[PDB]
């Protein structure tokens, strides 16, 4: 509850996007509350609730680099992606 911060609950949240993001930003929000588009600069690795695009993609697309674009690229995506099954 109170002795409970992102960088101590940081397990390694690569893939449980919404399930963990709401929890992450709920504590982390002293530094970047505003869902600010530059969210590829702090320990932020996701976006509050996110959209169905980003969710379905980064669920497999956590290769420790390309996430930093994918985190927020979903905001301007204009479509459902191109991946008929995740792997």
Swiss-Prot record:
Q: How does the record describe its quaternary structure?
A: Homodimer; the homodimer further multimerizes as homohexamers or homopentamers. Interacts with human PPIA/CYPA; This interaction stabilizes the capsid. Interacts with human NUP153. Interacts with host PDZD8; this interaction stabilizes the capsid. Interacts with monkey TRIM5; this interaction destabilizes the capsid.
Quote the subcellular location field of this record. Virion
Question: What is the covered span of the full protein?
Answer: 278 to 363 of 1435
Q: Which residue windows are transmembrane per the record?
A: none
**Name of the protein:** Capsid protein p24
Post-translational modification comment from the UniProt entry: Phosphorylated possibly by host MAPK1; this phosphorylation is necessary for Pin1-mediated virion uncoating.
Positions of the region Dimerization/Multimerization of capsid protein p24?
A: 2-87
Q: What does this protein do?
A: Forms the conical core that encapsulates the genomic RNA-nucleocapsid complex in the virion. Most core are conical, with only 7% tubular. The core is constituted by capsid protein hexamer subunits. The core is disassembled soon after virion entry. Host restriction factors such as TRIM5-alpha or TRIMCyp bind retroviral capsids and cause premature capsid disassembly, leading to blocks in reverse transcription. Capsid restriction by TRIM5 is one of the factors which restricts HIV-1 to the human species. Host PIN1 apparently facilitates the virion uncoating.
């Amino acid at each position: 509850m109170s002795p409970t911060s992102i960088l101590d609950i940081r397990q390694g949240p690569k893939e449980p996007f919404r399930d963990y993001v709401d929890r992450f930003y709920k504590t982390l929000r002293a530094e970047q509350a505003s869902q600010e588009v530059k969210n590829a600069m702090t320990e932020t690795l996701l976006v509050q609730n996110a959209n169905p695009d980003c969710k379905t993609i980064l669920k497999a697309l956590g290769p420790a680099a390309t996430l930093e674009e994918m985190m927020t690229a979903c905001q301007g995506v204009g479509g459902p992606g191109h991946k008929a099954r995740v792997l």
